[PDB]
């Protein structure tokens, strides 16, 4: 049974446009540019994009077509380094156990959203507390007692009933039904591979831009939005000289490309040989990155909005994360006209946003370990219902009482560190033990010309110096766990740093592993670790690239 | 079934010419990626391909030399060589990668056809 391949093009593309689009690109970017130097802060944000994540882009992209194999058994290319693709792949699954749960709550919130009376629009509800105050009576982004931050936290969370990680509590009934509704979907959008999944992006993929049109179309006329825009796109060059704005604009860069994750790797391996990955690498971080620039006017349209109905200034209600989409949007929504529709198209592209990047995080583990297993690619639909409901189980974590705080845990941890090690360790094996000048000729292969100097430099040198750099400031910017003015005890931490520890220990115990498996002297063991698993037979010829200095000065 | 059937292949005198033929079957050559290469002690080697779209592309050593092309009525893929070198002496393996979108990734290989070249 051969792989098969991609129905169209455009199922390839508009799933890793999905995969890369997300809840990321509208809520955290734009308050990024807002409080790092407005436009200025587009100069690191660009420039990182260029020069690294482009790059990672396109070599995951070149690597998956040309190899057809998931993020695991890839390193048949260097064996030494599978213990990366097993690393990516549980921090894949690490993510989907706390990424469901969000889109839990747009389906929630979408649910709730089918009322003339919105339930985050007033108090009076079971949920509401004594000191609930009507928001136009009303720092404001974190006030805590409007309807719509005590709907969030209280009706939707239950977080008021958690006193901390300690104390989660139950799963609550509501967020459970939501969670499987999103884990029955991601199912039956992935059980029958690509064939059916790359029909789905079409829809999840292309819907999150007719609700941006129309929610920037709307936003633009609201009386205030100006103000909003101007402080979203005020330029301070002065910005440019902290090294937090770079720190930010490489972080986002790197977590919204979603590059090395091994979901591009996936994708890529249904591609057929010839397709012109060096393109679609191009035209689809540019999308995700334009999809950003342009979701944060109408971002900050509402916030400009919200600013001009509160009477206080851009900052006090400039917000992030979780916060914005669920407390301030709400909120907006319900003053606007046709609160209604608004709600409803908002939580529908917030859950078109979540669902194929979920979809393509899934699909990475599916690939990666049924490429591994033949028994899981020959049983396709019990493997995607496995993984599917693991997810869900390890899930139900995060939608308990204070599964905030899980969920807090986990996305600090997860996927942090962990990946950004990862995804350095697997740049380095391609372009420095496989070979840039390998990858160079791979790709010549595929497509008749050999990637130009600057990617072979910056798969390289600045893709693997960048990345260290990513990994570096996240060691040092380590703050303890903490989650709005609760802060988590010492063995919360610790539990973070052994899910991060996790899945990278894989890296040396598989190369452990692999060395005294192999059988040897030392250097035909580090010879066969190095070598692709379709040379081994030069191996007994002495003849091994990486043990002459020409291999290792490529350029 | 696929079946990649290599020939043509042969001894050659250096600088002759040989066009090495590849019948295939189970699927059709004008959409699919047919790759050829070689292995002479040395590992396998691209040599050219005609691609899905029609766009053919050669290895460097033999850019310019070689020819590739596809009789869509014969359901062929031919590998017109000239010049041919000493260096050149190899089996040549016609590959099909894929028959395009919408299909099977068939990495199937012919059994391969020997050219040898004496100097």
């Known amino acids: 049974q051969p792989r098969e391949t991609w129905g169209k093009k455009i199922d390839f593309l508009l799933s890793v446009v999905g995969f890369a689009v997300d809840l990321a690109n509208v809520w955290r970017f734009p308050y990024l540019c807002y409080k790092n130097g407005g436009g200025a802060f587009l100069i690191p944000y660009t420039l990182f994009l260029i020069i690294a994540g482009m790059p990672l882009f396109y070599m995951e992209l070149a690597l998956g077509q040309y190899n057809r194999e998931g993020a695991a058994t890839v390193w048949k290319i260097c064996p030494f380094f599978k213990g990366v693709g097993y690393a990516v792949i549980l921090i894949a699954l690490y993510v989907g156990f706390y990424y469901n749960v969000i889109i839990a709550w747009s389906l929630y919130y979408l649910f709730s959203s089918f009322t003339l009376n919105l339930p985050w629009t007033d108090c009076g509800h079971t949920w509401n507390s004594p000191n609930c105050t009507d928001p136009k009576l009303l720092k404001y982004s974190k006030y805590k007692f409007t309807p719509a931050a005590e709907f969030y936290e209280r009706g939707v969370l239950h977080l008021h009933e958690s006193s901390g990680i300690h104390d989660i509590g139950l799963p609550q009934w509501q967020l459970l039904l939501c969670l499987m509704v999103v884990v029955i979907v991601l199912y039956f959008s992935l059980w029958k591979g690509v064939k059916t999944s790359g029909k789905v992006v079409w829809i999840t993929a292309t819907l999150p831009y007719f609700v941006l049109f129309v929610l920037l179309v709307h936003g633009v006329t609201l009386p205030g939005a100006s103000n909003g825009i101007n402080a979203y796109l005020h330029i301070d060059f002065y910005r440019l000289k902290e090294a937090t704005v770079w720190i930010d604009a490489a972080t986002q860069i790197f977590f919204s490309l979603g590059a090395g994750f091994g979901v591009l790797i996936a994708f890529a391996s249904y591609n057929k040989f010839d397709n012109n990955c060096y393109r679609d690498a191009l035209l689809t971080s540019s999308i995700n990155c334009i999809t950003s620039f342009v979701s944060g006017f109408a971002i900050f349209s509402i916030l400009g909005y919200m600013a001009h109905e509160h009477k206080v200034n851009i900052e006090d209600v400039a917000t992030e994360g979780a916060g914005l989409v669920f407390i301030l949007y709400p909120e907006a929504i319900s003053t606007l006209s046709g609160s209604t529709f608004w709600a409803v198209v908002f939580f529908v592209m917030l859950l078109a946003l979540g669902l194929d990047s979920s979809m393509g995080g899934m699909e990475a583990v599916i690939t990666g370990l049924a490429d591994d297993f033949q028994v899981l690619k020959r049983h396709r639909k019990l493997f995607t219902f496995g993984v599917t409901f693991s997810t869900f189980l390890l899930a139900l974590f995060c939608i308990t009482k204070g599964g905030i705080y899980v969920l807090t845990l986990l996305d600090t941890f997860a996927a942090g560190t962990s990946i950004l090690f990862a995804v350095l360790m697997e740049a380095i094996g391609v372009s420095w033990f496989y070979g840039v000048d390998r990858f160079s000729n791979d790709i010549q292969q595929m497509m008749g010309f050999r990637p130009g100097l600057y990617w072979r430099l910056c798969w390289k040198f600045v893709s693997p110096a960048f990345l260290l750099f990513v990994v570096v400031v996240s060691i040092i910017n380590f703050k303890p766990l903490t989650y709005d003015d609760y802060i988590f005890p010492p063995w919360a931490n610790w539990v973070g740093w052994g899910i991060a520890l996790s899945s990278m220990v894989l890296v040396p115990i598989y190369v452990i592993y692999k060395f005294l498996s192999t059988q040897g002297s030392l250097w035909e063991r580090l010879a066969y670790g190095i070598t692709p698993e379709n040379e081994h037979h030069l191996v007994a010829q002495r003849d091994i690239r990486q043990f002459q200095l020409q291999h290792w000065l490529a350029i | 079934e696929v079946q990649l059937v290599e020939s043509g292949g042969g001894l050659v005198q250096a600088g002759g010419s040989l066009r090495l033929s590849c019948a295939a079957s189970?699927?059709?050559?004008?959409?699919?990626?047919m790759y050829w290469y070689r292995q002479a002690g040395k590992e396998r080697e691209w040599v050219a391909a005609i691609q899905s779209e029609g766009r053919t592309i050669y290895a460097d050593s033999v850019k310019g030399r070689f020819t590739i092309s596809r009789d869509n009525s014969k359901n062929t893929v031919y590998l017109q060589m000239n010049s041919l070198k000493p260096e050149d002496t190899a089996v040549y393996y016609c590959n099909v990668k894929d028959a395009g979108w919408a299909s099977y990734q068939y990495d199937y290989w012919g059994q391969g056809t020997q050219v040898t070249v004496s100097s």
């Open positions: 189970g699927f059709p050559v004008y959409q699919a990626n």
